[PDB]
Ligand binder design. Structure first.
Ligand SMILES: Nc1nc2c(ncn2[C@@H]2O[C@H](COP(=O)(O)OP(=O)(O)OP(=O)(O)O)[C@@H](O)[C@H]2O)c(=O)[nH]1
Ligand SMILES: Nc1nc2c(ncn2[C@@H]2O[C@H](COP(=O)(O)OP(=O)(O)O)[C@@H](O)[C@H]2O)c(=O)[nH]1
Ligand SMILES: [Ca+2]
Ligand SMILES: [Mg+2]
Ligand SMILES: [Mg+2]
Lengths: 440, 421, 68
C-alpha cells in the first residue's frame, strides 16, 4: 500500500533517475541484480521500501519506475549498464528521434507517436499497486522532451488518474551547462502547460547545484554526474519519509499541507546540508546546530533567489541520521534569535520538523563525505519568484523579435500559445507578489 | 542510427568532397578498402552518421557523386579512397555544364537529375533515421551551382521534413575560372535563401587571402585552398561524428543557430591556420574567417565553437566567457546565451589543439554585397546575357534573384540595428 | 437536512473531479487537432511552392524549344 510511481523523462530526468535509483538501492541494501538478503518476505510485502519497490517471486526488487526518452542513447546505457537487471525491459522506453530542443516536437509531432504506449506501461505499474498514492515526475525545463513530452504526459495523467497526486522534480536551466538557446521558450511553455496538473514541484537550479559543487567540493568543472549525485541526495532526503519509517518520521504529504497555501503556489525552495568532501569532513562532526545553521545560508539552496528579500509562507525541516528533537529545538531556538526569518501575516511561524533515523549513504567513487546526519529544509517563500522573473526576462528579449519562433510554428504551434503562456507566467509573478502583501 | 546523406556535385564539389572523405576516414580509422584499423571505440560509436556497414564488415561512405562530365570523377576513382566509394553512386553525364547555371538547373542538369534521385532514394531507404542531407558544391560553376540547387529543390519535395545543409563555395576574382560567376552565384544564392536549412559560406576570396597573406603562398593552389576547406569541414562536423555531452545533429544545430529562416548563412573559422587563450583569440579574428567578412563590421546573432585536443575545460569556459565579456557590443543582446561551446578529446591529424568556429553574423552581408556589386555591373548593361536566355530563361528571373539577395542584405542589416529596448 | 448536505458535498467533489478531467480531455483534443491542421498546412504550402518551381522549369524548356 501507499505506492509511488516515478517517471523519468528526457536525458536529465533519466540521468537523475540513474542517480536516485542507485542511491535508493544502496540505502536499502538492494544489489544490482535486485536481490535484497534482508527481505524475508519473498515475492512481495508491505515494508516501507515497498512504496518504491515491487518484489517478484525470484526475490528481485523492482523500481516502480518508467524511463522515457524520444531517442535511445541515454536509456541504452541503462539497458546496458550496471543496474540493467533491476528493470523489466518494458519500463525502459525509447523512440528513434528526439525533440531537437523543441517543445512542439516533444508535445505534438514526435511525442504523440509514443504517448499511448507510455501510458500503457504506466498502467501496468499502477495495476501492481494496492493503494497507489501518486506520481513523481523528473524532467528538465529546457529540453524538447523534458518540456513538451512531460507536459503532454501530465495532461494525459490528469485525464487517466484524476486528482491523484503528481509531484515534479524540474531541472531549471543554467548557462554553464546549457544546450539550447531556446530553453527559456521551452521553460515558459512547459510551466504554463503543466501548472494546473501539478500538485507540488521542486525546482533544481543547475547553476545553484553547479555553484555548490564548485564551492563546497572544490570541483573545478562539474559534470552532470557531479550535479546528479548531489541532486539525488536532495531527492532522497525528500522521499525518505515514503521509503522508510520510524517514530519521529513525518510523511511528505503532511509537509505538503503546509507547503501549498494556494494551488498555484506550489513551488517549494529546497536547501541541503552538509555538502562536504571527505577531506574536509575527516575529524569534524558537523552537529545538528551547524547543518541547521547552514540551511539558512542562501549558498546552499537548490534555487538562486534571495529569501531575505521575500517572505516566508512555510518552513519545514527534514532531518536524517543521528538526530534527536532536543538538539533540533536548541538549534532552531538559536536560529530564531540570530536570524529574523519573516513570515506573511496570514501564516504561523513555527517550523515543522521530521526526523528519519536512517543515516545517509553515498555512492562509491563520489566526492561527498559520508556523514552521520543531514537535513533538507523545504520552505515556501515568495523569493522563488526571482527564478520566474529571470526566465521571463529571457523569453521577452527573444520573443519581442520573434526569434526562433518559426521552429515552433513549423510544428503547428501558434504565436497565441506563446503570448498565452507568457501571460500565465506574468500572472504567477503577480500572485507571488500578492501573497506577500500584508492583510487589511 | 542518425544517418546523413552526402552529395558532391561538379568540379569543386567533388574535389572538396573527396578531401572531406579522406580526412574523416583517417580520423575514424578507415582505410581505402573500407576496413576498420583503428585504436579507439570512440572512432566507431557514431560512425554510421557517415558510413554504412557492409559485407566483409566494411564501412562505406553514404556518399553520392554527381557531375555533368566524367572528368573530375575518374580522378576521384584514381585518387586514394577512390576505391571506398560505392561504384553505383557515381552519376555522371557527358555533355557538361559549360559553366552555365541555366544548364545545371534547367537543361542538361534536368536530364541527369532523376538518376541521382534514384540513388538518393536507395540511400535514404536504407536509413534507420534520416537526419537529412549535406551537399558540397560551388556556386561559380554550372553543375555545382545549377544542378546542385535543382537537386536541393527536388530532394526537398521528397523529404520536406529533413534538414538540408550545404557547403557552398563562393567565387573570388582572385582564383577565378570565368567572368559569368556573379550571375551563377546570385542565381544559386536566390535558391539557397529559400531551400536550405543551413549553409556554410566557404569563400575562395577568404581562402586565397589566408594562403597568400598569412600562409605566405604567393601562388596558392586549389590543393592549398582545399586543405583549408577540409580542416574546416572536419571541424564543423566534429560534433556530428563523435559522442559528446552535446549530442549534435543537423536539426538541433539549425534550431540553435537559425533565429529567422532566411538568415542561415554561416561564417566558418579555424585556428591554428598553442594555448587556449591564443586559440580563442585567433578563432574570432577576422583573419581566421573562411568567409571574407570582418565580424567587427557586424554583430553575431549566434555562434557555435568547438575545441579539439586535450585542454582544460575550466580554461576554455573562462576564455569563451572572456571573449563575450570583452566584445559584448558585437553580440546581440536580445538573444541571451547565444554562444555555445563543445570540447572534443580527439584532435585532427597533425595538430595538438584546434578550434573551429561557426558564426551567424550580420557581417556576412559584406560577402553578399561583393557578389551583388559585380553581378549588377554586368546585368544593367545586359552583358553576357544571351548565354542565359539561350536556354529559355527570362530577364525577370535575374531581377528576382538580385532583389532577393538585396532583401537578404536588408534583413541582416535590420537585425544588426535592432536593440533590446 | 444534514444528511442531504453531506450528499451534496460529496457529489460536488465528484462533479468537480469529473469536470476537471473532461475539460482537460477536450483541451487536449482541440490543441492536437489544431496542431495537425497547422502543421499540414505548412507542409502543403512548401510542396506547393516546390511544385510551382517544377511547372516554371517546364516553361523554360518548352520556351527554349520555341526558338527554332
Ligand atoms: N542536472 C542535470 N541536468 C541536465 C542533465 N542532462 C541535461 N540537463 C539539462 O537539461 C536541459 C536540456 O534538456 P535535456 O534533458 O538534455 O533534453 P531532452 O529532454 O532529452 O530533450 P531533447 O533531447 O531535445 O529531445 C539543459 O538545461 C541541461 O543542462 C543531467 O544529467 N543532469
Ligand atoms: N576552393 C575550391 N574552389 C574550386 C575548386 N574547384 C573549382 N573551384 C571554384 O569553382 C568555381 C567554378 O565551379 P566548378 O566546380 O569549377 O564548376 P562545376 O563543375 O560546373 O560545378 C570557381 O569559382 C572556382 O574557383 C576547388 O577544388 N577548391
Ligand atoms: Ca581537516
Ligand atoms: Mg535528448
Ligand atoms: Mg571549373
Amino acid at each position: 500500500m501507499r505506492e509511488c510511481i516515478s517517471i523519468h523523462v528526457g536525458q536529465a530526468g533519466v540521468q537523475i533517475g540513474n542517480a536516485c535509483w542507485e542511491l535508493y538501492c544502496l540505502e536499502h541494501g538492494i544489489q544490482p541484480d535486485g536481490q535484497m538478503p534482508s527481505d524475508k518476505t519473498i515475492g512481495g510485502g508491505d515494508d516501507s521500501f515497498n512504496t518504491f519497490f515491487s518484489e517478484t517471486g525470484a526475490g528481485k526488487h523492482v523500481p516502480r519506475a518508467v524511463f522515457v526518452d524520444l531517442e535511445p542513447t541515454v536509456i541504452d546505457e541503462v539497458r546496458t549498464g550496471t543496474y540493467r537487471q533491476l528493470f523489466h525491459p518494458e519500463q525502459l522506453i525509447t523512440g528513434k528521434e528526439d525533440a531537437a530542443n523543441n517543445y512542439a516536437r516533444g508535445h505534438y509531432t514526435i511525442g504523440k507517436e509514443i504517448i499511448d504506449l507510455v501510458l500503457d506501461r504506466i498502467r501496468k505499474l499502477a495495476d501492481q499497486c494496492t493503494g497507489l498514492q501518486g506520481f513523481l515526475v523528473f524532467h528538465s525545463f529546457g529540453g524538447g522532451t523534458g518540456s513538451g513530452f512531460t507536459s503532454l504526459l501530465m495532461e494525459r495523467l490528469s485525464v487517466d488518474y484524476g486528482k491523484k497526486s503528481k509531484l515534479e522534480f524540474s531541472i531549471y536551466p543554467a548557462p554553464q551547462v546549457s544546450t539550447a538557446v531556446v530553453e527559456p521558450y521551452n521553460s515558459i511553455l512547459t510551466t504554463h502547460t503543466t501548472l494546473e496538473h501539478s500538485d507540488c514541484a521542486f525546482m533544481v537550479d543547475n547553476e545553484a547545484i553547479y555553484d555548490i559543487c564548485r564551492r563546497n567540493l572544490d570541483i573545478e568543472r562539474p559534470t552532470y554526474t557531479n550535479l546528479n549525485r548531489l541532486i539525488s541526495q536532495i531527492v532522497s532526503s525528500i522521499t525518505a519519509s515514503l521509503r522508510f519509517d520510524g517514530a519521529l518520521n513525518v510523511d511528505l504529504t503532511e509537509f505538503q499541507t503546509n507547503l501549498v497555501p494556494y494551488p498555484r503556489i506550489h513551488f517549494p525552495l529546497a536547501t541541503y546540508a552538509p555538502v562536504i568532501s571527505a577531506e574536509k569532513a575527516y575529524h569534524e562532526q558537523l552537529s545538528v546546530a551547524e547543518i541547521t545553521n547552514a540551511c539558512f545560508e542562501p549558498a546552499n539552496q537548490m534555487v538562486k533567489c534571495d529569501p531575505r528579500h521575500g517572505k516566508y509562507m512555510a518552513c519545514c525541516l527534514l532531518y536524517r541520521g543521528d538526530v534527536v528533537p532536543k538538539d533540533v529545538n536548541a538549534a532552531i531556538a538559536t536560529i530564531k534569535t540570530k536570524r529574523s526569518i519573516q513570515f506573511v501575516d496570514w501564516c504561523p511561524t513555527g517550523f515543522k520538523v521530521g526526523i528519519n533515523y536512517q543515516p545517509p549513504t553515498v555512492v562509491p567513487g563520489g566526492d561527498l563525505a559520508k556523514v552521520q546526519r543531514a537535513v533538507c529544509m523545504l520552505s515556501n517563500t515568495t523569493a522563488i519568484a526571482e527564478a520566474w522573473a529571470r526566465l521571463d526576462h529571457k523569453f521577452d528579449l527573444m520573443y519581442a523579435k520573434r526569434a526562433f519562433v518559426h521552429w515552433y510554428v513549423g510544428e503547428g504551434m501558434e504565436e497565441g500559445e506563446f503570448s498565452e503562456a507568457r501571460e500565465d507566467m506574468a500572472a504567477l509573478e503577480k500572485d507571488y507578489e500578492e501573497v506577500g502583501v500584508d492583510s487589511v | 542510427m542518425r544517418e546523413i546523406v552526402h552529395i558532391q556535385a561538379g568540379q569543386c564539389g567533388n574535389q572538396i568532397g573527396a578531401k572531406f572523405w579522406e580526412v574523416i576516414s583517417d580520423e575514424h580509422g578507415i582505410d581505402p578498402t573500407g576496413s576498420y584499423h583503428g585504436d579507439s571505440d570512440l572512432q566507431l560509436e557514431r560512425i554510421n552518421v557517415y558510413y554504412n556497414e557492409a559485407t566483409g564488415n566494411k564501412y562505406v561512405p553514404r556518399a553520392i557523386l554527381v557531375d555533368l562530365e566524367p572528368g573530375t570523377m575518374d580522378s576521384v576513382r584514381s585518387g586514394p579512397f577512390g576505391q571506398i566509394f560505392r561504384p553505383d553512386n557515381f552519376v555522371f553525364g557527358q555533355s557538361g555544364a559549360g559553366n552555365n547555371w541555366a544548364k545545371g538547373h534547367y537543361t542538361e542538369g534536368a536530364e541527369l537529375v532523376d538518376s541521382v534521385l534514384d540513388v538518393v532514394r536507395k540511400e535514404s531507404e536504407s536509413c534507420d533515421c534520416l537526419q537529412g542531407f549535406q551537399l558540397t558544391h560551388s556556386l561559380g560553376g554550372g553543375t555545382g551551382s545549377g544542378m546542385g540547387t535543382l537537386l536541393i529543390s527536388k530532394i526537398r519535395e521528397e523529404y520536406p521534413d529533413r534538414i538540408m545543409n550545404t557547403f557552398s563555395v563562393m567565387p573570388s576574382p582572385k582564383v577565378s575560372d570565368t567572368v559569368v560567376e556573379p550571375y551563377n552565384a546570385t542565381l544559386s544564392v536566390h535558391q539557397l535563401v529559400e531551400n536550405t536549412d543551413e549553409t556554410y559560406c566557404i569563400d575562395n576570396e577568404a581562402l586565397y587571402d589566408i594562403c597568400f597573406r598569412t600562409l605566405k603562398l604567393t601562388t596558392p593552389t586549389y590543393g592549398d585552398l582545399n586543405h583549408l576547406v577540409s580542416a574546416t569541414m572536419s571541424g564543423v562536423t566534429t560534433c556530428l561524428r563523435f559522442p559528446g555531452q552535446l549530442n549534435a545533429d543537423l536539426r538541433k544545430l539549425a534550431v540553435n543557430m537559425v533565429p529567422f529562416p532566411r538568415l542561415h548563412f554561416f561564417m566558418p573559422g579555424f585556428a591554428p591556420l598553442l594555448t587556449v587563450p591564443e586559440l580563442t583569440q585567433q578563432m574570432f579574428d577576422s583573419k581566421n574567417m573562411m568567409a571574407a567578412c570582418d565580424p567587427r563590421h557586424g554583430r553575431y546573432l549566434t555562434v557555435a565553437a568547438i575545441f579539439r585536443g586535450r585542454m582544460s575545460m575550466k580554461e576554455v569556459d573562462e576564455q569563451m566567457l572572456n571573449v563575450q565579456n570583452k566584445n559584448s557590443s558585437y553580440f546581440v543582446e536580445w538573444i541571451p546565451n547565444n554562444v555555445k561551446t563543445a570540447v572534443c578529446d580527439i584532435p585532427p591529424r597533425g595538430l595538438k589543439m584546434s578550434a573551429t568556429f561557426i558564426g551567424n553574423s550580420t557581417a556576412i552581408q559584406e560577402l553578399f554585397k561583393r557578389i551583388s556589386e559585380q553581378f549588377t555591373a554586368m546585368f544593367r548593361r545586359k552583358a553576357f546575357l544571351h548565354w542565359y536566355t539561350g536556354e529559355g530563361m527570362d530577364e525577370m528571373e535575374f531581377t528576382e534573384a538580385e532583389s532577393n539577395m538585396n532583401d537578404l542584405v536588408s534583413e541582416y542589416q535590420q537585425y544588426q540595428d535592432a536593440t533590446a529596448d | 437536512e444534514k444528511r442531504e448536505h453531506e450528499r451534496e458535498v460529496i457529489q460536488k467533489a465528484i462533479e468537480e473531479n469529473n469536470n476537471f478531467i473532461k475539460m482537460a480531455k477536450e483541451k487536449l483534443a482541440q490543441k492536437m487537432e489544431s496542431n495537425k491542421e497547422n502543421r499540414e498546412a505548412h507542409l502543403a504550402a512548401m510542396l506547393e511552392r516546390l511544385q510551382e518551381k517544377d511547372k516554371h522549369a517546364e516553361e523554360v524548356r518548352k520556351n527554349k524549344e520555341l526558338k527554332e
